[PDB]
């Protein structure tokens, strides 16, 4: 999946 991240935003 994509999703941002726990803290980061590395969307895929």
Cα within 13 Å of Cα(1), Cβ side: 4
Method underlying the structure: NMR
Q: Which residue has the tokens 């969307």?
A: 11
Terminal Cα-to-Cα distance of the chain (whole angstroms) = 7
Query: Using an 8 Å Cβ cutoff, are 11 and 4 in contact?
Result: yes
Measure the CA–CA gap between 12 and 7, rounded to whole angstroms: 14
The 3-class SS string of 1-12 reads: CCCCCCCCCCCC
Query: Using an 8 Å Cβ cutoff, are 10 and 1 in contact?
Result: no
Query: Using an 8 Å Cβ cutoff, are 8 and 2 in contact?
Result: no
């Amino acid at each position: 999946y994509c999703k941002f991240e726990x803290a980061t935003f590395x969307s895929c």
